[PDB]
């Protein structure tokens, strides 16, 4: 029995920016009221985790990062009603409290209990459940999945199908659901439309999947790494373009290709310049552009508002617009029902001990998703 | 009996930026194929016409400005099918050719034959119908309503009810329709919502009318001229705020007043800083902000894209999102049926010869709309 006791386990601690993860023993406190302790089974490597390493996504350090995962409930605190010991679960980096004005809104998903806007790196109660070498360690987005065991608030966990394969469905905790929902829920891609997707990583591939599911006629993938094109075409891109191949700026190229602008564009990289390019390539009167990539901390973009005055719509979203706790179990059931595929996103499967190697595959351009297994 | 002949008439010619209009004789050529010559009856003074004088809205000079008007067809060119001599008409500063990809789209209204994006100051065939002192004079937006007679392309004119009061319905040619449609069509304001309207001129008052027609529960007007507040409350504002009264930035004030941000905000001024403030004050997860004001030429704004990534929508529109030639006659029929009021917008009436006094009233802050009568 571990229930009610401190667990000593392995975790990947990031002590300061621009350093490898350190794989060492941490102590994980038992869950308090309304908290859940989870034994991790699989976690993905998302570019957002790398941005924490880079320092472009700011969160308190030292930290246990990781937010795209799946595991099994080890124990529950007093008052927990939505999961039990032995349940398969996905932690939710966007919580769903069900009580705030956003949770009550039909189209909101960015719950006011989130730890994204103004990150504290704690549990809801303002404290940490983690220590390492006698020092308190911060949580990340109320998830912290780069650990054999984590503790999450009940509003930050969803119970999923007992038969689901956790080394695949961990992607429903971030990159699949984000990209797919950006297309089908946030943009509301229409049948017969032309879409442009900037960035052909795991999230951008998921946007392509959604555009194809929504019946887009043309899906133009855009990436500076032409090694990404073959998989983008496998999941539905009709054409791929590398901005580096052209004398003209790519917004001009895509406007020409689409006979006057695309219906829907997506920025799935995280750069200010590509957010403005993506907006500009959508048709001036009725185009929609969705920002999915996470921009660099504290930097503003510059843009001409005439792009909007002619009729364009610009919007962004976290987690594909999905209300997290309602939607994650439904997405897992849809995957079990063969409504969408996850294998095209998974290029590498490594033991958790090879986390640094996984990040080097992402940085070098080789991987889409590496799944780490515990 | 003027049909096929040059007409000599008075017009207000703008020879140079930052100068009074010159009321003097012009020559108006007869209409070519698919053109309509109109005897003007009434024209409004819109801030966009003043921005031309200021040089912040660029169009070629010398010019006959004016775009918000109503008149009576004097003659038609070869091939015209949609109006006849003696019909009451409103010139359309946004055309509706009915054939381009925008005109065919269900949402779009910014027809590709517009003269707004890259203004030439000509008719569709690239020539002018106006001479003054033996020199060619530019058109403005394909309308040029500050003249006793104008010539417009058939795609830039709508036939309206024969019993229409032209001294009121001229406002359907720009300010009323723009503001009202920005609320009801572009933003799609919902019953029970909270709205913020930045700028309480004739367009912003029309936005308030639309928000109240849509059932908003709270409509907060924002203006630095507190003399604007009484009329804003008459047409539906529930409260007004003057940014100059507050130590804190008005986005923070409006976020506090709305218990975490408004549902819908509207920028109806034309300044870069209020475009960013208006986006900021809508609720971060589900808010919508609409740009209606016309920004200063060739200037970029700076903003933090995290405002969008949390879930906000930012859009703009021309002419309230209305397909112009379909919509104008319906709006006139609705006015005739008392579905909305125009009198609250009309604060002054002057003869056309007093155009410079009408512009002085707008610049002083004293008027909403002055209507000029020919
Ligand atoms: N909104 C959310 O909820 C959410 C969720 C998941 C990820 N993200 C962000 O989404 C972005 C993509 O994540 P990911 O798919 O894991 O990353 P990724 O696998 O690194 O993919 C990014 C792709 O962009 C390509 N790229 C880089 N620079 C350019 C450029 N200038 N022009 C065109 N292509 C370029 C690059 O080659 C790569 O294939 C990151 O910014 C993440 O932080 C956001
Ligand atoms: N999108 C369109 O189709 C369209 C159509 C009509 C007008 N316009 C533009 O809409 C804008 C408003 O036109 P209008 O109603 O005729 O002008 P207006 O009558 O000048 O009203 C603008 C209001 O803004 C107020 N204002 C000025 N600066 C500020 C400030 N910093 N903060 C708060 N309030 C301030 C000002 O006191 C005035 O009451 C102008 O930019 C027009 O060019 C756009
Ligand atoms: O990849 C998902 C993700 C985000 F979308 C963010 F906006 C963020 F700040 C972050 F830390 C994160 F992990
Ligand atoms: O007031 C309507 C109006 C606009 F919305 C513009 F964008 C524009 F350039 C213009 F000249 C105009 F008159
Ligand atoms: Zn909530
Ligand atoms: Zn992620
Ligand atoms: Zn058209
Ligand atoms: Zn106007």
> What does B259-297 look like in DSSP terms, one character per residue?
TS-BSEEEE-S--HHHHHHHHHHB-TTT-EEEE-S-PPT
* 8 A C-beta contact, residue A248 and residue A219: no
Would the CB atoms of B314 and A317 count as touching at under 8 Å? no
Residues with CB under 5 A from ligand 5 (ion): A 97, 100, 103, 111
Residue B233: Cβ-neighbour burial (10 angstroms; 0-12, 13-18, 19+): middle
In angstroms, what is the span from residue A31 Cα to ligand 3's centroid?
Answer: 25
Would the CB atoms of B315 and A312 count as touching at under 8 Å? yes
Query: E-assigned strands of A170-317?
Result: 194-198, 218-222, 239-241, 264-267, 288-291, 301-303, 313-316
Residues with CB under 5 A from ligand 8 (ion): B 46, 48, 174
A308 to chain B: which residues are within 8 Å by CB? 291, 314-316
Euclidean distance between CA atoms B186 and B168, whole angstroms: 24
Euclidean distance between CA atoms A313 and B289, whole angstroms: 10
Answer yes or no: is the C-beta of A280 below 6 A from any ligand 3 atom. no
Answer yes or no: is the C-beta of A199 below 6 A from any ligand 1 atom. yes
| Closest atom of ligand 2 to CA, residue B367 | 19
- Is B103 annotated for ligand binding? yes
Would the CB atoms of A316 and B295 count as touching at under 8 Å? no
The angle subtended at Cα A283 by Cα A278 and Cα A286, nearest 5°, is 115
Three-class secondary structure of residue A125 per DSSP: coil
Three-class secondary structure of residue B39 per DSSP: strand
Spatial CA neighbour of B295 closest among B319, B322, B267 = B267
| Closest atom of ligand 3 to CA, residue A175 | 1
Question: What letters, b where the CB count within 10 A reaches 16 and e where it falls short, cover A126-152?
Answer: eebbbbbeeeebbbbbbbbbbbbbbbb
Torsion-angle region of A166 (φ positive above 0: left; ψ -120 to 50: alpha; else: beta): alpha
B310 to chain A: which residues are within 8 Å by CB? 110, 116-117, 316, 318
Kindly state whether A203 is in contact with chain B, defined as any CB-CB distance less than 8 angstroms. Answer: no
**Pocket residue to mutate for ligand 2, from B52, B94, B222, B268, most atoms within 8 A of Cβ:** B268
Question: What letters, b where the CB count within 10 A reaches 16 and e where it falls short, cover B210-230?
Answer: bbbebebebbbbbbeeeebbe
**Pocket residue to mutate for ligand 3, from A46, A58, A59, A116, most atoms within 8 A of Cβ:** A116
Would the CB atoms of B295 and A314 count as touching at under 8 Å? no
Kindly state whether A177 is in contact with chain B, defined as any CB-CB distance less than 8 angstroms. Answer: no
CA B191 to chain centre: 26
* Exp. method: X-ray
The pair of structure tokens assigned to A166 is 């956790």
* 8 A C-beta contact, residue A143 and residue A91: yes
The angle, 0 to 180 degrees and rounded to 10, between the axes of the packed helices A355-364 and A47-54 is 90
Smallest CA–CA distance, residue B108 to chain A, in Å, is 5
| Closest atom of ligand 1 to CA, residue A225 | 37
CA B100 to chain centre: 23
A109 to chain B: which residues are within 8 Å by CB? 285, 311
Smallest CA–CA distance, residue B235 to chain A, in Å, is 25
Spatial CA neighbour of B111 closest among B329, B327, B293 = B327
* 8 A C-beta contact, residue A325 and residue A315: no
Answer yes or no: is the C-beta of B319 below 6 A from any ligand 2 atom. yes
Kindly state whether B192 is in contact with chain A, defined as any CB-CB distance less than 8 angstroms. Answer: no
Peptide bond into A326 cis (omega under 30): no
Sign of CA dihedral B325, B327, B333, B335: negative
Contacts of A220-223 with CB under 8 Å at 24 or more apart are: A220/A194, A220/A195, A220/A196, A220/A254, A220/A257, A220/A258, A220/A262, A221/A197, A222/A196, A222/A197, A222/A198, A222/A250, A222/A254, A223/A198, A223/A199
- Is B281 annotated for ligand binding? no
* 8 A C-beta contact, residue B138 and residue B122: yes
Compute how many other C-beta atoms are within 10 angstroms of the C-beta atom of residue A84. 12
Residue A302 is nearest to which of B291, B302, B306, comparing CB atoms? B302
Q: Which CATH architecture has domain B176-320?
A: 3-Layer(aba) Sandwich (3.40)
**Pocket residue to mutate for ligand 1, from A293, A320, A328, A346, most atoms within 8 A of Cβ:** A293
In angstroms, what is the span from residue A49 Cα to ligand 3's centroid?
Answer: 8
Residue B337: Cβ-neighbour burial (10 angstroms; 0-12, 13-18, 19+): exposed
Spatial CA neighbour of A283 closest among A250, A315, A259, A253 = A259
| Closest atom of ligand 1 to CA, residue A222 | 33
* 8 A C-beta contact, residue A328 and residue A173: yes
Resolution in A: 1.2
In angstroms, what is the span from residue B21 Cα to ligand 4's centroid?
Answer: 19
């Amino acid at each position: 029995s571990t229930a009610g006791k401190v667990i000593k386990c392995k975790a990947a601690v990031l002590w300061e920016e621009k350093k490898p993860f350190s794989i060492e023993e941490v102590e994980v406190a038992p869950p308090k009221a309304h908290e859940v302790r989870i034994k991790m089974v699989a976690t993905g490597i998302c570019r957002s985790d790398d941005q924490v390493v880079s320092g472009t996504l700011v969160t308190p350090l030292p930290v246990i990062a990781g937010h795209e995962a799946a595991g099994i409930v080890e124990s529950i605190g007093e008052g927990v009603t939505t999961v039990r010991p032995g349940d398969k679960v996905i932690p939710l980096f966007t919580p769903q409290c069900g009580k705030c004005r956003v949770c009550k809104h039909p189209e909101g998903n960015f719950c006011l209990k989130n730890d994204l806007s103004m990150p504290r790196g704690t549990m809801q109660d303002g404290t940490s459940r983690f220590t390492c070498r006698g020092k308190p360690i911060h949580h990340f987005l109320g998830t912290s999945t780069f650990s054999q065991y984590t503790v999450v608030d009940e509003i930050s966990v969803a119970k999923i199908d007992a038969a689901s394969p956790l080394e695949k469905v961990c992607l429903i905790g971030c990159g699949f659901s984000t990209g797919y929902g950006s297309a089908v829920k946030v943009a509301k891609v229409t049948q017969g439309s032309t879409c442009a997707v900037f960035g052909l990583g795991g999230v951008g591939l998921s946007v392509i999947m959604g555009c194809k599911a929504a019946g887009a006629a043309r899906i133009i993938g855009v990436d500076i790494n032409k090694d990404k094109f073959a998989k983008a075409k496998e999941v539905g891109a009709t054409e791929c373009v590398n901005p580096q191949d052209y004398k003209k700026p790519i917004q001009e190229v895509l406007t020409e290709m689409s006979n006057g602008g695309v219906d829907f564009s997506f920025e799935v990289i995280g750069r200010l310049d590509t957010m403005v390019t993506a907006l500009s390539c959508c048709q001036e009167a009725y185009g929609v552009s969705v920002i999915v990539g996470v921009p660099p901390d504290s930097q503003n973009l510059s843009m001409n508002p005439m792009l909007l005055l002619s009729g364009r719509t610009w919007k962004g979203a976290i987690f594909g617009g999905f209300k997290s706790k309602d939607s994650v179990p439904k997405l897992v059931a849809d995957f079990m029902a063969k409504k969408f595929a996850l294998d095209p996103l998974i290029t590498h499967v490594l033991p958790f001990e090879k986390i640094n190697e996984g990040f080097d595959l992402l940085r070098s351009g080789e991987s889409i998703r590496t799944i780490l297994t515990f």
